[PDB]
Design a protein around this nucleic acid. Structure first.
Lengths: 110, 98, 95, 84, 95, 110, 85, 97
DNA sequence: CCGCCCTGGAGAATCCCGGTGCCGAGGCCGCTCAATTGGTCGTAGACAGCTCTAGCACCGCTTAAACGCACGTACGCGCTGTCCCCCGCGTTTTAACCGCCAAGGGGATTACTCCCTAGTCTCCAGGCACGTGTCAGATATATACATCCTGTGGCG
DNA sequence: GCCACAGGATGTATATATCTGACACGTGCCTGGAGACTAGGGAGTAATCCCCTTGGCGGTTAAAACGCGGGGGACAGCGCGTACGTGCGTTTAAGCGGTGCTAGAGCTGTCTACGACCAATTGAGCGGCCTCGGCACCGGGATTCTCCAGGGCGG
């Protein structure tokens, strides 16, 4: 049938994250009785920004490690070397991400 | 004359090696046996997923490494380089576990 | 044929292509990224629901999401996330 | 197929605890550290496994899944990334 | 004449009377008791909501509440609470 | 329309806490779409048991303090003396409750 | 009356910090403890008041309420009993 | 002269303040501190007395708990005096710093 | 004067590069389900008017507490030394791990069906709000009780 | 050159009286919980497919156990000099009480737009399957870290 062209709300808002999927996950998650029109757009934008920031830092870490693929070690290095990312993910353990190289000054051999 | 490294250089080398590496430091079969023995008290004839046991092992190792970092901080605070059961007790008590 | 499961894998890959065109992602790292997206979604949605309930409202709105972001994310992360969200909502409303 | 395991806490050997302490950044280790560490690991695993088995029993399942462990850790405020 | 603010004041007073027949409770202690009751209600109901979401259910049943109680309350408190909840549920269904 | 005499569900289940009020709070808290009939009864029973336990300990503390009224100090004493109640309320500050009287052994004189 | 307050952290006097340490069970106090305690108290207050003011601003109110303070503390995982419901 | 030894009055104060239940910080100075801090967040703010008292109770409880942990660290270092390094170690282990 | 101090090779571990190879990241395709279009409706929310509680501001006073300074004693910090416990390492024993195989218990799905919960209307009674009058509590005070601190008796 | 404590000196639990204010009780009233009923879909149940978990078996070798030497450091002892606790005289501003003012919290009544809902379309991404190179690994070589056996001039 002849209706308007199906333009996704992600493209309408200029995002790469699924506005419709975020809207469904907010509606079906039993968070409130109603979900606004701008709430999925705002939440998708925030999720996209955070994902972009962590991916940028992880790609920089992978490049510094002479590799072209992001691995859990690279994600851990990015998160624990960015101060605000470490603040946001302080109580989060990344699988097979290891720990940062941090040997105490007193333990250093002098 | 036989060669012998001084006490501390090999330990520092191990510290660097294990901090750079990211693999599990506990044998999988013994850890799985311990997990199953512990879970026996809660529900008999239990089965486990391999991913479940791996999650338990990774979480436990992360917890123990964090606890050892805090223990090292306590030992340094007490003007020592050796970690001790009292250091572990203080770390847990400050963190709220004892 | 079994039940199909949803994930943010393709969206995280698209964002990675936008940011670093010549970098790839392993399966485990992609799973960790999906868990991270889910955790941030859960935190923000929980905080916005708490705000809606504590103000005796019944709607989750962009204002609720903005307040939740400002409460959860620290400092510059929260400031930049607020800017990105406001820009996205303005574009969505203009369109 | 009734098998009862016992004294498996010794499977966490002294060199394994040394590797964990080295990863944590520890130079010297006291002798009595290993028994204390085994006890700490045992209580941690007891708590996490008890919560996981509670979730499993509520689900009416018989095998402890990875999501049960993840939810147990989340109940403990120890979010683990990479298992769903 | 204003909006009524509900509280567990009379219920906590009745429980105090049935436990210690010759004891009072000050206004500050009553407020703290109301906050404690509301806090425990929130804890248990949030845990029950998480359980219902995890099991892909859409109902909070006595089983969900009991599992939440076991998860939250420690040891002997969980055992006694489960026993009392089961006794009350059976006494309700009998009538 | 004189129907049958009403019976409160608190009295039907042998409880003091309000089963109907608990049911309404469960239904209006966005906890789930549907709420079972026995869930309010179970939750109200658990709340009443916890209230009775903490009130019994607080009344004992008040009696030991030679007073006939429970105050926040007595509530804090009861909570921090009962091990399980302390573990349940470990992330809780009781207003105007003070702290447990304890002095370290090495701080004691000799 | 439009007035500005400044440097009230010195209003947390040395005897007050000494009394807090005494209630904490401290038998002897170093002289540099007081400024460190002032800094810690200021950081804690800033963190809590930021969230309380955020809640108030969201509520389109100009009055910070005890319930907003309680909500901020609960956000920090420091549940406070006795200031509402 | 009846000067007490250095620590008997301290122990007496410890017992007194652990027995009592009041607020150890002066209300007007603490309220002014709260208002000064809140100036940087939103100008022309009004605080309920209940809100100021809630902040004071939370702050005093936090500081007392931190001083308990600080005393634990100082005794661990084999000292009866608490020090800023004790405070820093306690906060670092708790995760605040 | 003598231990104490300053140094370049030897051995081991780390780094560095090149060839091999694989399996896991990555593109691509039909296809079903979830997102998108488009009217409806009734309610959540926006807003203007209004009431009065409650927060802010100020004056005076009364004094409790904060401030400041002298003194000295208990304490943090530094130095030496003893020995003992932990580290480094070589050798032997142990079982973790890897590969493959089997089978069966249990996860996950799919009809279906009925009973359990949402939703409504009504009623009445349990519970909030509001007076109020007294009894538990704070306080002022004289205790006698409980606890700390130094000289005086005492000698080897 | 120390050991016990008697008694002074001071903090403090006890018993008595005297307000006093808020706590518990009663009572009118109102809105929300219970009774009774209908409607529909959520979950219980039963049968089935298959997957993945456990157990077994064998070979390899990586790791753990174990013993031995020795020296790094933990801990005790001792000393000393700064620094914090104790206490008393000054001061200041906190608490309280009282009055005044008004700003904003709370409520109420209309009215609007907006989000849930539902019918219908369609394309987006999950699943599954080829396909190639990024990274682990083995082989070989250069560099570097660390430690020990010679040269040296010091108050």
């Amino acid at each position: 049938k002849t209706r308007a062209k199906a333009k996704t709300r992600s493209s309408r808002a200029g995002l790469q994250f699924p506005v419709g999927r975020v809207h469904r996950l907010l509606r079906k998650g039993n968070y409130a009785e109603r979900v606004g029109a701008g709430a999925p757009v705002y939440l998708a934008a925030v999720l996209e920004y955070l994902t972009a920031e962590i991916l940028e830092l992880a790609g920089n870490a992978a490049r510094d490690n002479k590799k072209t693929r992001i691995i859990p070690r690279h994600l851990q290095l990015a998160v624990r070397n960015d101060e605000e990312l470490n603040k946001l993910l302080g109580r989060v353990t990344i699988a097979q991400g290891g720990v940062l190289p941090n040997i105490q000054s007193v333990l250093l051999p002098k | 004359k036989p060669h012998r490294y001084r006490p501390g250089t090999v330990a520092l080398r191990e510290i660097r090696r294990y901090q750079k590496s990211t693999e599990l430091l506990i044998r999988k079969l013994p850890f799985q046996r311990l997990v199953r023995e512990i879970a026996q008290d809660f529900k008999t004839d239990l089965r486990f997923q391999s991913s479940a046991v791996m999650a338990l092992q990774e979480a436990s190792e992360a917890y123990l490494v964090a606890l050892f970092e805090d223990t090292n901080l306590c030992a340094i605070h007490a003007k020592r380089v050796t970690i001790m059961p009292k250091d572990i007790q203080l770390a847990r008590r400050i963190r709220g576990e004892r | 044929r079994k039940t199909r499961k949803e994930s943010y894998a393709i969206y995280v890959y698209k964002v990675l292509k936008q940011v670093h065109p010549d970098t790839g992602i392993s399966s485990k790292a992609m799973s960790i990224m999906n868990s991270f997206v889910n955790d941030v979604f859960e935190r923000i949605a929980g905080e916005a629901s708490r705000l809606a309930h504590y103000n005796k409202r019944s709607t989750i709105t962009s204002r609720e999401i903005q307040t939740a972001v400002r409460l959860l994310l620290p400092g510059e992360l929260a400031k930049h996330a607020v800017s990105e969200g406001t820009k996205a909502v303005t574009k969505y409303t203009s369109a | 197929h009734r098998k009862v395991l016992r004294d498996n806490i010794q499977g966490i050997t002294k060199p394994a605890i040394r590797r964990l302490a080295r990863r944590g950044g520890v130079k010297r280790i006291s002798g009595l550290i290993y028994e204390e560490t085994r006890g700490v690991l045992k209580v941690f695993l007891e708590n996490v496994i008890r919560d996981a088995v509670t979730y499993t029993e509520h689900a009416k399942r018989k095998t402890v899944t990875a999501m049960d462990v993840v939810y147990a850790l989340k109940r403990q405020g120890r979010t683990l990334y990479g298992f769903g």
